[PDB]
Amino acid sequence: DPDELARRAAQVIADRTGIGEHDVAVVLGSGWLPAVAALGSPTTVLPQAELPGFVPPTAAGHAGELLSVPIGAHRVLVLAGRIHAYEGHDLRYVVHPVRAARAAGAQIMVLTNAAGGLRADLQVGQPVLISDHLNLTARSPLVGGEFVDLTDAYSPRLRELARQSDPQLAEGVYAGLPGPHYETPAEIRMLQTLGADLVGMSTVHETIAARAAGAEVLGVSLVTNLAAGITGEPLSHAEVLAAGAASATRMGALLADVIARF
Amino acid sequence: PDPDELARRAAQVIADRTGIGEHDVAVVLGSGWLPAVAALGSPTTVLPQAELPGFVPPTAAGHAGELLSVPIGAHRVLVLAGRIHAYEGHDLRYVVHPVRAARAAGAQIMVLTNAAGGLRADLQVGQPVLISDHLNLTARSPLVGGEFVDLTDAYSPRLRELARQSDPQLAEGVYAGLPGPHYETPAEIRMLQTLGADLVGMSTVHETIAARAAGAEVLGVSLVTNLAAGITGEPLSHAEVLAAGAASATRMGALLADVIARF
Amino acid sequence: DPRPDPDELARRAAQVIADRTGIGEHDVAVVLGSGWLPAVAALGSPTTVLPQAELPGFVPPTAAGHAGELLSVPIGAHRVLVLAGRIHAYEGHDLRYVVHPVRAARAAGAQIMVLTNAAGGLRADLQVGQPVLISDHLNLTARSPLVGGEFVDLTDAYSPRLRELARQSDPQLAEGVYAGLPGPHYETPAEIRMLQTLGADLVGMSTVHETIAARAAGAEVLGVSLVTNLAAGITGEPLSHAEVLAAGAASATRMGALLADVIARF
Numbered sequence: 037d038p039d040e041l042a043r044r045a046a047q048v049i050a051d052r053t054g055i056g057e058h059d060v061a062v063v064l065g066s067g068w069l070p071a072v073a074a075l076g077s078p079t080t081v082l083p084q085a086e087l088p089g090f091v092p093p094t095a096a097g098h099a100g101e102l103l104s105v106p107i108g109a110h111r112v113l114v115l116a117g118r119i120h121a122y123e124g125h126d127l128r129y130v131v132h133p134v135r136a137a138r139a140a141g142a143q144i145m146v147l148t149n150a151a152g153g154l155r156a157d158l159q160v161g162q163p164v165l166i167s168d169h170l171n172l173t174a175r176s177p178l179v180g181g182e183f184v185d186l187t188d189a190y191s192p193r194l195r196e197l198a199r200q201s202d203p204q205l206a207e208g209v210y211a212g213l214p215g216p217h218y219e220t221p222a223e224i225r226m227l228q229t230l231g232a233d234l235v236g237m238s239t240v241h242e243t244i245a246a247r248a249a250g251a252e253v254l255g256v257s258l259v260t261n262l263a264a265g266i267t268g269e270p271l272s273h274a275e276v277l278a279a280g281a282a283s284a285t286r287m288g289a290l291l292a293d294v295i296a297r298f
Numbered sequence: 299p300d301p302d303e304l305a306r307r308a309a310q311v312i313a314d315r316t317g318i319g320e321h322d323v324a325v326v327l328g329s330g331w332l333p334a335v336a337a338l339g340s341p342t343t344v345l346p347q348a349e350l351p352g353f354v355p356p357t358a359a360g361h362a363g364e365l366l367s368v369p370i371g372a373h374r375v376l377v378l379a380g381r382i383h384a385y386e387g388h389d390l391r392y393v394v395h396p397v398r399a400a401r402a403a404g405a406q407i408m409v410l411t412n413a414a415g416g417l418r419a420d421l422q423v424g425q426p427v428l429i430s431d432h433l434n435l436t437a438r439s440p441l442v443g444g445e446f447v448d449l450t451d452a453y454s455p456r457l458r459e460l461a462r463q464s465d466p467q468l469a470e471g472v473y474a475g476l477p478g479p480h481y482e483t484p485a486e487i488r489m490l491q492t493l494g495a496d497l498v499g500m501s502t503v504h505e506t507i508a509a510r511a512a513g514a515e516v517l518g519v520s521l522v523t524n525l526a527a528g529i530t531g532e533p534l535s536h537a538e539v540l541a542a543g544a545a546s547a548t549r550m551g552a553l554l555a556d557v558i559a560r561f
Numbered sequence: 562d563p564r565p566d567p568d569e570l571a572r573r574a575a576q577v578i579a580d581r582t583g584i585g586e587h588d589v590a591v592v593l594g595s596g597w598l599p600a601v602a603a604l605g606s607p608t609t610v611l612p613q614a615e616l617p618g619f620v621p622p623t624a625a626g627h628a629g630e631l632l633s634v635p636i637g638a639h640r641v642l643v644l645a646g647r648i649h650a651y652e653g654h655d656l657r658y659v660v661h662p663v664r665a666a667r668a669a670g671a672q673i674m675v676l677t678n679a680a681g682g683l684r685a686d687l688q689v690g691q692p693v694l695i696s697d698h699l700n701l702t703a704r705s706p707l708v709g710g711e712f713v714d715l716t717d718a719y720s721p722r723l724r725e726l727a728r729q730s731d732p733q734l735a736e737g738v739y740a741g742l743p744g745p746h747y748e749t750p751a752e753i754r755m756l757q758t759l760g761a762d763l764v765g766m767s768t769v770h771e772t773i774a775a776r777a778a779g780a781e782v783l784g785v786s787l788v789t790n791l792a793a794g795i796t797g798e799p800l801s802h803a804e805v806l807a808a809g810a811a812s813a814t815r816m817g818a819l820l821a822d823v824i825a826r827f
């Protein structure tokens with residue numbers, strides 16, 4: 037039962053942070069990890085591996101951390117380092133952070149990710165709010181039949197608050213694929229025809245579990261490269277890494293400023 | 299252990315318990331269709347699915363539905379009131395087992411029904427729609443190994459013709475089968491329109507494939523319980539979806555009975 | 562972490578292959594598509610033939626029966642590994658088994674993989690019996706044979722250079738985008754219209770994972786489809802494996818002769 041496990045995690049977080057409950061959670065994906073320090077200095081820093089349900093028993097190594105950071109008047113749970121579906125782990129582990137945070141009282145989830153840009157106006161290094169998504173993984177983190185509507189899965193209200201911080205923020209449709217491989221140029225032309233503006237390898241399941249758990253969602257992509265076949269040249273791993281490293285401080289500041297308005 | 303073997307074993311229990319050697323037609327009632335049972339016709343036999351070989355997975359449980367034996371016209375029909383979807387996490391063998399068991403019990407025609415969101419402009423809530431073809435978007439198949447089944451005319455034009463003889467105004471449409479259990483985003487719905495879908499659901503495709511692989515004809519019927527996500531400008535309503543299925547239950551059952559009678 | 566380890570198994574299979582064939586390393590590997598079996602002879606006289614069942618990592622423990630063979634064939638100045646028989650994802654086994662032949666071949670020295678298949682034709686000009694080079698693909702399986710975070714760019718996954726060489730062999734060769742679906746069932750007419758909208762010219766039940774694994778392992782790939790039928794709904798006639806096998810046998814000698822002449826130019 038994912039619910040009872042998130043419940044236990046929430047209890048551990050409360051006792052380890054001294055904070056009765058948190059209000060917001062932020063998931064830092066690829067291209068957003070170096071922006072952690074910019075969100076604010078943490079009051080508590082604890083390894084995900086020491087928290088119930090975060091890391092699967094078999095496969096291991098060293099998970100990220102879970103930070104408790106005060107931002108504005110909020111107590112924010114910051115997840116630095118997520119476990120991906122491409123490793124083969126059940127999706128309950130992928131969405132556990134969201135479920136635990138909700139159990140911890142978090143009602144807003146800020147989900148970030150690295151993404152390839154498909155719409156012509158999007159540039160490398162540009163953060164883009166997610167207006168909607170295309171779940172192209174043929175999976176779901178939900179088991180059983182509860183009713184879960186995904187209309188406005190990415191709260192228009194929260195996107196409006198984000199624009200108070202930066203009125204020029206672009207908005208677009210994110211396509212979530214299984215990965216880990218990047219797409220062929222043919223696949224990118226396909227995604228374009230399907231209405232995708234951004235392409236990535238995460239986030240969709242977290243959004244679904246979030247909405248199912250009663251939380252609002254703000255998604256933010258960092259365009260780390262133009263999608264395959266667009267430039268006429270192969271992708272550059274170096275560029276993808278630099279996109280995240282360079283905008284680190286700027287991205288951390290933006291998120292803190294936005295979250296403060298929540 | 300074997301899928302076909304379990305189907306045969308199930309057919310045997312069905313035969314003995316219903317007192318009917320073979321059933322000519324099988325009906326799988328989808329979400330929202332349950333209350334149509336009475337209008338379909340009173341059963342002569344009712345047996346718990348949990349008491350039939352192969353119907354329930356080992357681990358996850360609780361209590362499955364019922365299997366009905368109903369005389370309709372000059373036919374003996376197996377009516378499955380309660381199914382298990384792929385989104386429930388079980389191997390597809392359990393999802394299509396009712397179809398294979400029905401075939402083993404003699405069913406040559408499978409009538410597969412379901413609840414679906416409507417994408418084509420002319421479709422209205424409460425409208426039954428004949429499935430003309432499907433888009434299997436689950437990235438899966440209930441077939442394992444080299445079972446290369448042709449899916450041209452998967453939904454018998456013959457049976458669709460008979461259905462129209464019952465109601466000449468019945469519309470047809472392409473059904474998009476997704477994994478579920480979450481409903482779609484407006485963007486996903488726009489994507490489905492581009493791909494040629496008229497209806498969107500969370501079942502049926504695997505049942506259709508298994509039916510065809512087993513050599514049975516298929517009539518597909520969707521009940522539009524809501525307009526697809528992003529079309530009304532308002533969020534989907536669980537209350538309204540459920541209200542829609544109950545509201546058209548009697549009408550759906552009566553429709554099914556008249557069409558089947560023509561087989 | 563996962564046991565067995567893909568790369569360890571590939572290297573061990575390479576060693577077995579080297580000892581059994583008496584050849585230290587091979588230069589090219591050919592994976593034969595379904596229906597293409599009778600084309601093996603056309604490729605050339607084998608110096609070594611061995612059961613795939615006698616090679617580590619090729620056959621899953623549970624499900625069995627009898628796998629194909631692996632042949633060592635000299636083609637031009639090349640020592641070529643020919644895989645007559647393979648396993649597809651629809652058989653239900655981990656993709657590790659689907660791409661192991663490619664990984665084993667690379668570990669054996671092959672830096673060029675020639676992946677062949679039977680496909681339904683969707684683009685109007687492609688005809689039954691026509692060999693088509695694969696220019697790109699659409700992986701519609703929602704899976705990947707990769708489980709690590711390594712950066713893998715699929716741009717030019719099907720080497721433009723190799724397609725250039727294939728055309729020096731046959732300047733008439735057409736090219737097309739191949740859509741790989743899970744199978745084993747064939748497509749409905751509606752799904753075929755959908756694939757056409759997505760940009761697919763050919764449709765099949767293999768190849769995509771092999772290509773991805775090959776690119777990840779550092780090998781170039783030349784993809785070759787044999788149109789064995791027009792995709793569902795085009796002719797209004799139902800498809801059949803028999804039909805596919807028929808086209809495969811009918812073009813066997815021509816396909817093998819073509820592969821041989823193209824590989825000779827590598």
Ligand SMILES: O=c1[nH]cnc2cc[nH]c12
Pocket residue numbers: 150151152153218219235236237260261262263264276
């Ligand atoms: O181009 C891309 N495709 C898929 N995922 C990512 C993540 C960053 N860039 C990309």
Ligand SMILES: O=c1[nH]cnc2cc[nH]c12
Pocket residue numbers: 413414415416481482498499500523524525526527539
């Ligand atoms: O809108 C819908 N989407 C997917 N499945 C169903 C089943 C009933 N309505 C819907």
Ligand SMILES: O=c1[nH]cnc2cc[nH]c12
Pocket residue numbers: 679680681682747748764765766789790791792793800805
């Ligand atoms: O039409 C087809 N669809 C899928 N696979 C194949 C393989 C040969 N022909 C086809």
Ligand SMILES: OC[C@H]1NC[C@H](O)[C@@H]1O
Pocket residue numbers: 446595649678679680744765766767801802805806
């Ligand atoms: O006839 C169908 C088979 N041939 C090619 C497909 O991949 C499948 O294995």
